Structures are given as C-alpha cells and as structure tokens.
Amino acid sequence: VNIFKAGADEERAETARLTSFIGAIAIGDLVKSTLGPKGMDKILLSSGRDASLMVTNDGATILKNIGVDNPAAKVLVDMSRVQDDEVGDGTTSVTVLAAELLREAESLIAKKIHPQTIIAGWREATKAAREALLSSAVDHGSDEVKFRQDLMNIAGTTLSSKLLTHHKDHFTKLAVEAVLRLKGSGNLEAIHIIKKLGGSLADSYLDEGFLLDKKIGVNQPKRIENAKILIANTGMDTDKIKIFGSRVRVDSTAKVAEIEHAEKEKMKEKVERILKHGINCFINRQLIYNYPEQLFGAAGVMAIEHADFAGVERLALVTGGEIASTFDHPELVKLGSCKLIEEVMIGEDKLIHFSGVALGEACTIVLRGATQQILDEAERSLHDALCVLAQTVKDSRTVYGGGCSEMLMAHAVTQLANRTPGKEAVAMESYAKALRMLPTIIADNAGYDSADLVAQLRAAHSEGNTTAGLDMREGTIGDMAILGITESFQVKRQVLLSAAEAAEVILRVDNIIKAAPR
Template sequence: MAGLGGTPVLILKEGSQRTAGREAQRSNIMAAKAVASAVRTTLGPKGMDKMLVDTLGDVVITNDGVTILKEMDIEHPAAKMMVEIAKTQDEEVGDGTTTAVVLAGELLKQAELLLEQEIHPTVIATGYRDAATKAIEILKDLAVKVSPDDEELLKKIAITAMTGKGSGNARGELAELAVKAVKAIVDEDGSVDIDNITVEKKVGGSITDSQLIHGMVIDKERLHPNMPKKVKNAKIALLNAPIEIEKTEVDAKIEITSPDQLQAFLDQEEAMLKEMVNKIVSTGANVVFCQKGIDDLAQHFLAKAGIYTLRRVKKSDMEKLARATGARIVTSLHELTPNDLGKAGLVEERKIAGDDMTFVEECENPKSVSIILRGGTEHVVDELNRAMEDALRVVGVVVEDGMLVPGGGAPEVELALRLREYAATVGGREQLAIEAFAEAMEIIPKTLAENAGLDQIDTLVALRSKHEKGMKAAGLDMETGEAVDMLERGVVEPLRVKTQAINSAAEAAVMILRIDDVIASKSTGAGKEGKEKEPSGMGEDFD
C-alpha cells in the first residue's frame, strides 16, 4: 500500500502478505532451521529413524535425509530450498544429504547471531563464500588417493554409507555386492553409470539371501507354458518390433464374398506369422526378448520351436540386456541376423517370493548387472534398497574420482581449526563470518556425539585436542566416544560427498540470507471444503 495525497493506493492484491527487513530474514531462517532440526537426529550410525505417514496412510520408515524431506509436505518457500539442497546432494553423489541440510541450518543459525550484531547480510555472504572456497582447498589437502582396484577400501566406503540404514549385521555382505556390481559396469573411460545396475526388491528370506547376478533379472515370466523353463548357451535376440500382423497405416476395406476367401485370408495371416517366427529360428536364436506385442498364434509357433520368449519388456531393461549380453536391439524383424544375437550361459525362469522372474546369467563380460535384495518385511526391503543405492553411488564416485576423506566428523573438526586460522589473516568484518562458518562446521561432530548418547562438549574438546596435535584423521568412535584415527578404522567417505555438501549448504545459506522481502500472493485455489488455502507456513510438523 502506498499513500498519494492521503489516498491509499493498492499495489498488491487484497489479501496478499508482505514481510520485509529483519522480520523476513527471521522467518526464513527459522523455517530453514526447523527443517534442519527435523532431520538432525538421523545423522550418523546411531541416528534414529523417522516414520512418515502420507495422506493415503502409506508408511515409510527411514533415516535417509532426502527421503524424509521428499515425504514431508513442506509449504514454506525457504524450507523448500532446504529440500532442494538434499535433492541436489542425492543426485550428485547419492550420500551426505542429512549432512548438507544440517550444515545449511547451522550456517543460518550462526548468521542470525551476526545479524543481531548489526553485521550486514552482504558481508556475511562474502565471508561464507570465502570460507567455502577455502574449505574445499583444505579438504583436497586432507584427501587420500584410492585405487579402483583396492576392493577392501571400496568395501569400507560402502559400509560407511550403509551404516545406520537398517542393513544391520549384513553390511559386509551387502557392501561386497555393491563393490562387485560397480566394478563390473565401469566403462573404458573410467566413468560409472549406476543406472546399469538393476536393483530388484523381494520380500521374504533374510538380508543375507540378497545376491548379485552377473547379468539381468527381469520381473516377467515366460510367455507360454510350453516354452522351455531353462535355456543353456542362450543366443538372445532383442526385438523392438511386434511379432504380429500390423494394422495398415491408411483405412482399408477388404470385401469377402465367400467362406473360401475368408479361410484364405486367415491362412495368409497364419503363414505371415509363421514366416516371422521362422525368420527368428533361422538366425539360431533360442531366446527372444520383445519390446512390443506378440500374437497368440506367434506365441504357439515360438513355443513349438522351443524358444524362450518374453514380451513387452521395458525399454530400459532392453538397453541393459544389450549391455549385459552384447546383443543389438533390432527394430525390424527382417533385418535380424546371427550377428545381432547376444550370448548368455543360462536363461531361466525362477520363482522368488511367489513371483516368476527371468534370470539372464553367466554373461561373458556384462556391462549391466542385477542385485536382488531380500528382507523380512516390505519396510526392511525398502530401507535396504535406499542403503544399497547410497552404497552403489558412493563406490561409483570413488572409482571415478579416486579420492576419499576420513569420516566420523574428522574433516569438519580439521576444517573448523584451519578456518579459524584463516579468519585471523583476513581481517575486517568478513573475519567474523569466516569464524561463524568454522563454528558451524562443528555441528557435525556435535550431532554425531549427541545421537550416540555422548556428551557434546567433552567429545568436541577431545577431537580438537587431537587435531591441534596434528592428527588430521581423528574422528569420533561411536562405541567408546574417544577420538581415534578414522583411516585406520576404515571409516571413510568420498571427497565429493563433503565438497558437494559444503558448497550446497553455503550457497543455500547465502541465498536465504540475502532475502529481505517476502511478498506472498493471495491464494486463489480453494481447498476441498471450499475454504481458501492459508498463507504458506511451515504447518504443524515443526512445533
């Protein structure tokens, strides 16, 4: 609202809300801190789980930061930015989502104290950016090189990523599956595409029944009961073309005047289908995976020829089959030649947890593999799947980058120590912001200690003391609460997880800090009861 000669002039729609200055900053920081505190208790191997119930009554039990934030129905715009941090972290490196969100929340908490001292947000933003750049440099100094062939170390990285995510005592076996799977799909240029690993979840059995298949598992059964259940030395044809009579592109009518003509027409259709199947048989194929439909009569001919067949296989599965077996996907049946066929030692239909699935195994050099995860209940299997995804992603990142850092809060304590030294050399008001950044780093070891039921202050003092003596890899032993060498313990994380978390947290904190005016338009959508939506707020989840 603006005044013009005493007459009020409406600029915004009636009902719009505007919050400006310190009030806007306070509101945004409070919302962001509320999101950080919601996931904070899940951090580390001793972190607790959250049970999330959606509007349909579906239950998710997890301590995976990004899953919690995705499932929570968050309204506040600043809080949504915190969710974005977690999503970015998850897409880039697959782990460290909770760390990134907790860091961002703590950076804003420290910034709030500086704002109360009348330090301008731009000064804080500049200091935070400098500190983040310096932190990345320090981390690179801390990092240790790792060879992609060092399976033991890769296994330790996978175990660290899985710890606390419901994998229990089976972490060792699952980590081994993750490392073998990633090593199988590394491309010639050293890049790793985790999409080439298919993870199938099946309820039943125990976690230790999970297995790695050097090939593909497809959640489909053979097309016809007369087809063989097992094919050894399989020659596999991948078809992106239907084995059925296609309708004409243009409208056409066929006039039939006698039963003989109708019979001839049907005989011709049958002959065409038989010719299609004969074409497949002539190439020597004994297994067919078809992306499109297959006519019932064609199914009969394929079964008669003893060819194991699946139809309507997903496009993504077809591409993975091509990578696993070396076959080429053919889009025209007439173009199929023996050179297009892939090979597998065994194609077999097996029943797992009551479902028939097709296993394509014993491939020579599969660039696509599958993992079957088993567990007692659906919630266990779902959480196991999230743990496995994290493990696969971090192992993939380390194989690509070849750099890792110690875990257990060690890098954060070292960063806090070195950033305080750096702050002293900067001077000016930015120095206070860099010191605040260093202070915020210590939230990670503090939270790890708190979640393990240890004393925060005692733990932090012990860790600082070791780092001041030059023990850069000293982190928190969750069992004893002592500061020990994390590299010796095998608690390690990829360098990229830490750099991404610090960059994302700093950028989000700076962005939220620089907002000094929030203009919320009046909501036009009415709810189910005909009421208009409330102005966006955090909801009651964070009381």
C-alpha cells in the same frame, strides 16, 4: 494504504528474516536425528492414500515427502533434492549444516553486522575451506589392492546409517561386487533392484547372473542350456500393420478369407526369418500374440514377452546382444549368448534365471527382508550406496570422514580468520563453529559427551593429527586410516559448495512476499 490483493503479505527485514530462520532451523532439527552411524530414522505417512507410509533415514526423501509453506524451507528442500541427485547421502549433512549456518547467522544478526559483510566473509571462508579440503584428498589409481580396500570402506561408511547397518559387511560385499561389475559404466540402470517379501534381510543377495520378473510363454521348454539369445522391439500381438491405415475393400469374402491367410503366412515367415538365426531364446518389450509363440514352440524356442525398455537394456548389457528389428541380415546382428536359462521360484513367484552370462555389464540384487517399509528403505539405501560408489569409480580420490575432514576445514578457516582482521573475521569464526557443529551432533546422537569430544578433536587437529577422527563404536578419537572411515571427495565438496550457496541466497533475502493462493 492497501496495495496488494486480499490474502497477500509483506514482511520486511525483521519478520521476513525471523520466519525464514525459524523455518530453516525447524527443518534442520527435524532431520538431525537421522544423521550419524548411531543415527535414527523417521516415519512419514500419507495424508490419505490408504496410509502410504515410508520408514526412512535418508533425509532427501524426508524433505521430498514433507509439505512446507515457509519459502526458505522449500528452498532447502530443493537443495537436498539436488544434493541427493548428486551423491545420495549427506542430504542429511547438507541440510543440517545449512540449518546451523542460518542459526548462527541469526546470532550474528543479533550482533548487528550488515548481512552483505556476512556474505563476503562466508564466501572467503568457503573458498579457504574448499582449498584446504582439496589439499587433504587421497588418490588411489592403479593400486587395485588399496583401491578395492578403500572401496569397501566407502560402502561400509555410507551404509552405516540406514537400517542395514547390522549387516554392513554383507551389503558391503554386495555393493562392491555390483559396481565392480559395471566395468566403469555409470549407468545404474544396469543394476536392477528387485524386491519381494519373505526371508531375512541377510537372505538378500546378488545372483551370479541376471533375473527377470516375467511369465514364460505357453509350453516352450522351461529350461535351456547353451542358450542363444535374440532381442527386438518388433511387436507381434499388435499385428504388424502399415501405420497410415489403408483400408481393405474386397468384392467377396473369399478375398477377406485369403487375406486372413496371408496375414498368417506373413507372420509365419517373419517367424522363420527369426529362426534362421538359429536362436533358442527370444524376448521383446512388446506383447507377443500367442500364434507366434505357437510357431516358436513348433520350433521349440523359448520366448519371453513384454519386458520393458529397462529389462531390454539390462538383457543387452548382460548378454551382449544387439536389440534388433526386421532380422533381415543375420550376419550383421550380433546375438546374445548365455550359459544357461532356467526358471527359479523365490518366495512365491517363478523367476527367469540367467546364469553364466557372457558379459558382466549388468546385474540384479535380490532383496529379501521383512517389511515393504524395510525393503523400501533398503532399496533406497542401496541405490544411494551405488550412486556414491559409482561416483567413487569415476573420481578415484577419497577423504577421511568421521567429522575429521570437516574439522580440518574449520581449523584452516580459523587460521585464516586471524589474517582477516576486520568484521569478516567474526563471520569466519562463525563458519568455523558451524562446521564443527556437525560431528558434535554426530556424537550427540551417539549419546557420547559431545563437548569434550569436539574439543579434544580440535586440539588434535590444531596440533596437526590430520588423520585423527571419531570412533562411533566406543566414542573416542582415533586413527581413521586404521578404521577406514572415509568418503568420496566429491560428496563433501558438493556439501560445502551447495551449503555456502544456500546460505548466500537465504541471507540475501530481506523480504518475503506472497501472492494470494488460488
């Protein structure tokens, strides 16, 4: 008998599983093309936004922009979003691995083993795999030489999936220098990513200093040397008032006239307080009235107005100044110092150049290239690279990738499968096969013979060649340490853990229930 309102469903334990798994596998095979050093990338187009479209390789964005109705698929999409929040790439990996997990779990359901046992076995295998992975980690502490070497290795690895691959060395230098500039600060906002058309992608670069996309005031000096810098949030054009909103009631317009006058002198003496610090460069996020800048030009002090909180932060980091207010005690505020300030034009627009900076805390990369899509995806790729690379700085351990690490995981899981004996062992072997499926897909998109490659790699690992991995420029097994095809431990750890949790939650479902959409 009808129970729900019209437009509501009830799928129980056959159709629920079927729909969930179809959605999961569809999501997986939807993104498999983007993974791998020879991987591909997608085109996503808005429904109607003047056709707002994003050529994309990072799977996280792909799942973000796609509208999915099957609830399990949406769960996976949120999963990828979180994983990107953590490491940047492997969203690709996480989704594809989860998808194959679900497909192979469906195959097990065909074998008709109770899902609860599947969950228990998968939990055991995941524990074993994470332990084996931890056993395979490699640290690099004070060894600055090997450290920086492995760092650029990480850059080259993760970068070689987006379009920037054919310039791996260049952007590798870029990211390495950028993150090394952070002095261990994990605040990526210290890195600004300016993008503007024109020039080859190779022309993209990191300045020696800092850049600002703002307009100078009226003719204050355009270029400044041995610049002294001061930063504040005190609004000027919003003429400083007393927020409660007192009136002004006066008997004669003489009084209103003198009140205007007093307003101007009050502004002027604030300006003079500013100048008492003896500072030739001043900025503020607020808009500045032109009378203040006229006073500034009378002092000949260059001033840049309306650089938002992000810009203020970056200036503070790069120049060491303490963004300020009321300027009341000059000795108690530390100014900002830079070697030189000048205006340079790139492509079409004059930009504010900050060379010779006291603090290397902040930086900003110029993005030259071909397409707003190309530039957009390059932006996204560099952001992911910076994310993973900062994570590397926080945790100075690495893992040998190229599928090699994952195959070690599978090998250990298979070994534990023998000590299992029971139905769980079937799920153990299941997990191992699903894990091994990843580099299979890699070499697949690499157009090499996947079947032999994976078997040979497993043979090498079961032998014990824990270093042997995959070459993507010739399609063969090789020493990863020679090739430096490595990645952060934390990345793959999150991959595994999140995938296991996703598998647990998805399999535990055995009924979908939709209320009628409003």
